[PDB]
Design a protein around this ligand. Structure first.
Ligand SMILES: NC(=O)c1ccc[n+]([C@@H]2O[C@H](COP(=O)([O-])OP(=O)(O)OC[C@H]3O[C@@H](n4cnc5c(N)ncnc54)[C@H](OP(=O)(O)O)[C@@H]3O)[C@@H](O)[C@H]2O)c1
Ligand SMILES: O=C(O)Cc1nn(Cc2nc3cc(C(F)(F)F)ccc3s2)c(=O)c2ccccc12
Length: 312
């Protein structure tokens, strides 16, 4: 099936297009191509600094009647400098204005860590420490719930939340809406079996980010493990006459995850969508899982003192 049922009653496409690092001058066309090819889910964020350009693409394809707004599943995220109760709606509205939408299908707390509000995404003190905010995730969550009740977003969720942090939301006094989604890093070198079982058991859908290992992340090193070039994964792909990226996308799909590979390359945007015509075997799946190295690609601030750092 192409969509998975969320705990808010809505269906979410299990394949979406990532937009982190997609240059502002390239992402409009990337998203137009993605919609032409059949993508219906776009993963966005204010912090990606390209929501205006994404929104241009969405608007043109709505205009062209290639798609209807109800068929689209548009996701964005609340950046760390806006965890304060009084700033959340403003943040959402800015995202909505840039995307040129009147609602979001899903809005996530991007990271559990709140940062000092200001123009800066990563406000630091004179020593280079990130300056935290004194807001806790449970009041942030209340503010996310208001957005549902105001009609700005159809669903709310979390991202980069660990087991204990998800549990705190679930156990919030006066919890009104459960998180629909936890969007986390997930691929064969970081399989996250425990976290995914815990979320899925609570009816929380998991989205796998960086499914190709984010080879374009700015802090990558040439020496780094490479999923795309792992000969073992190469082998499985060849067995199925698919590419290694297609296997890497199909893999979380069969774990009942949502997955959001990023590309601005039209041929890859198309290739990445052609993952509904083959099946990995249970053995292929277990073998892929066996490659876990607990290797996390996307996380800076590893030495942060932030009380809500999720990866200790
Ligand atoms: N919640 C959060 O904190 C968080 C964190 C990280 C990521 N995410 C989301 O998840 C999305 C995906 O993760 P990601 O951007 O980190 O990386 P990713 O999707 O794992 O990999 C992106 C890299 O793969 C290349 N690529 C794409 N398709 C390919 C193919 N078929 N063959 C070979 N190379 C291919 C892309 O190149 P080209 O673009 O040049 O084609 C780009 O360099 C993000 O864009 C963002 O939407 C969320
Ligand atoms: O965010 C994206 O989607 C991708 C993403 N990841 N990272 C790595 C990060 N490492 C963090 C560590 C913490 C911490 F928990 F330590 F405080 C908090 C927040 C972050 S962001 C970035 O630095 C970043 C910068 C601009 C746009 C996107 C990103």
């Amino acid at each position: 099936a192409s969509r998975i049922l969320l705990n808010n009653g809505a269906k979410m496409p299990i394949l979406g297009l990532g937009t982190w690092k997609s240059p502002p001058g390239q992402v409009t066309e990337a998203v137009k191509v993605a919609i032409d090819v059949g993508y219906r889910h776009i993963d966005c964020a204010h912090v990606y600094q390209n929501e205006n350009e994404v929104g241009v693409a969405i608007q043109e394809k709505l205009r062209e009647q290639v798609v209807k707004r109800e068929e689209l599943f548009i996701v964005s995220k609340l950046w760390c400098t806006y965890h304060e109760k009084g700033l959340v709606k403003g943040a959402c509205q800015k995202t909505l204005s840039d995307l040129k939408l009147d609602y979001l299908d899903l809005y996530l707390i991007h990271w559990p860590t709140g940062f000092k509000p200001g123009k800066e995404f990563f406000p630091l003190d004179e020593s280079g420490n990130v300056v935290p905010s004194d807001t806790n995730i449970l009041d942030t969550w209340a503010a996310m719930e208001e957005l549902v009740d105001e009609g700005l977003v159809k669903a709310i969720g979390i991202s980069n939340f660990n087991h204990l942090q998800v549990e705190m939301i679930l156990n919030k006094p006066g919890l009104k809406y459960k998180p629909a989604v936890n969007q986390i890093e997930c691929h064969p070198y970081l399989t996250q079996e425990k976290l995914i079982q815990y979320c899925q058991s609570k009816g929380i859908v998991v989205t796998a980010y960086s499914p190709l290992g984010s080879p374009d992340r700015p802090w990558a090193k040439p020496e780094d493990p490479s999923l795309l070039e792992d000969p073992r994964i190469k082998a499985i792909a060849a067995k199925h006459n698919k590419t290694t990226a297609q296997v890497l996308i199909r893999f979380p799909m069969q774990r009942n995850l949502v997955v959001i590979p990023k590309s601005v390359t039209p041929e890859r945007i198309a290739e990445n969508f052609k993952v509904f015509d083959f099946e990995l075997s249970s053995q292929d799946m277990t073998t892929l899982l066996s490659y876990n190295r607990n290797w996390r690609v996307c996380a800076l601030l590893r030495d942060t003192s932030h009380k809500d750092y999720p990866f200790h």
